[PDB]
């Protein structure tokens, strides 16, 4: 039980953030779906999608057993702090900029907001197009939406 699969996403961080605390370690995510949320406070559609994702999180995070982790494209530590403060979920520490770069290129993230779903235990990927489905399927009927990419 080393969470080997999930660890593959974090070459430069051990623990991640949960509010003011930065002692959250990967095993705490065992058995869950984890969403990487690529976002920034300078991005208008991000600023509007964030409250939508929070509504979805309030409704389904417990019953559908998932967690969200911010991967920030913010310009400064100050901007990161103010923006992440509005969020109830986890964050990759802002100081790990190279880790943010690793994930951004790994998933071919070219614009934000983007929401990518992964399985914590196996480390497998479900979809990179979860943003679309938070909006289209607010009741989470088809969650966690594998292969949204199949769509025309």
Number of helices: 5
User: Which value, in Å, is the CA radius of gyration?
Assistant: 14 Å
Cα distance, first to last residue?
A: 39 Å
- The proportion of strand residues reads 15-25%
Using the 3D structure, state the CATH architecture.
3-Layer(aba) Sandwich
User: What is the count of structural domains?
Assistant: 1
Structural class: alpha/beta
> Percent of residues in helical segments?
25-40%
* SSE run: HEEEHEHEHEEH
> Mind describing the biggest β-sheet?
5 strands, mixed
The spatial strand order of the largest sheet comes to 5-4-3-6-7
* Counted beta strands: 7
Shape: globular
Query: What's the CATH superfamily, by name?
Result: Glutaredoxin
For this structure, the CATH topology is Glutaredoxin
In CATH's first tier, which class applies?
A: Alpha Beta
Domain Thioredoxin: 15-152
GO molecular function, one term: thioredoxin-disulfide reductase (NADPH) activity
Pfam family, one: Thioredoxin_8
Disulfide bonds: 43-46
Describe the structure.
- The protein has 152 residues and is an alpha/beta fold.
- The chain has a single domain (1-152), classed as Glutaredoxin, CATH 3.40.30.
- 30% of the residues lie in helices and 22% in strands.
- The chain has 5 helices and 7 strands; from the N terminus they run αβββαβαβαββα.
- It has helices at residues 4-7, 44-60, 77-84, 97-106, 130-136, and strands spanning 15-18, 21-25, 33-39, 66-72, 90-91, 114-119, 125-127.
- The strands form 2 sheets. The chain has a 5-stranded mixed sheet with strand order 5-4-3-6-7, sandwiched between helices. A two-stranded antiparallel sheet has the order 1-2.
- Strand 3 (33-39), helix 2 (44-60) and strand 4 form a beta-alpha-beta unit.
- The radius of gyration is 14 Å and the shape is globular.
- Disulfide bonds join 43-46.
- This is Tryparedoxin II.
- One of its GO terms (cellular component) is nucleus.
- Residues 15-152 form the Thioredoxin domain.
- GO terms for molecular function: thioredoxin-disulfide reductase (NADPH) activity.
């Amino acid at each position: 039980p080393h969470m080997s699969g999930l660890k593959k996403f974090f070459p430069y961080s051990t623990n991640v953030l949960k509010g003011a605390a930065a002692d959250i370690a990967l095993p705490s995510l065992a058995g869950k779906t984890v969403f990487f949320y690529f976002s920034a406070s300078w991005c208008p559609p991000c600023r509007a999608f964030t409250p939508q994702l929070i509504d979805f999180y309030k409704a389904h995070a417990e019953k559908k057993n998932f967690e969200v982790m911010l991967i920030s494209w913010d310009e400064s530590a100050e901007d990161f702090k103010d923006y992440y403060a509005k969020m109830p979920w986890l964050a990759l520490p802002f100081e790990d900029r190279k880790g943010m770069e690793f994930l951004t290129t790994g998933f071919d993230v070219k614009s934000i907001p983007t929401l990518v779903g992964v399985e914590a235990d196996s480390g497998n990927i479900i979809t990179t197009q979860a943003r679309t489905m938070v909006v289209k399927d607010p009741e989470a009927k088809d969650f966690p939406w594998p292969n949204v990419e199949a769509k025309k």
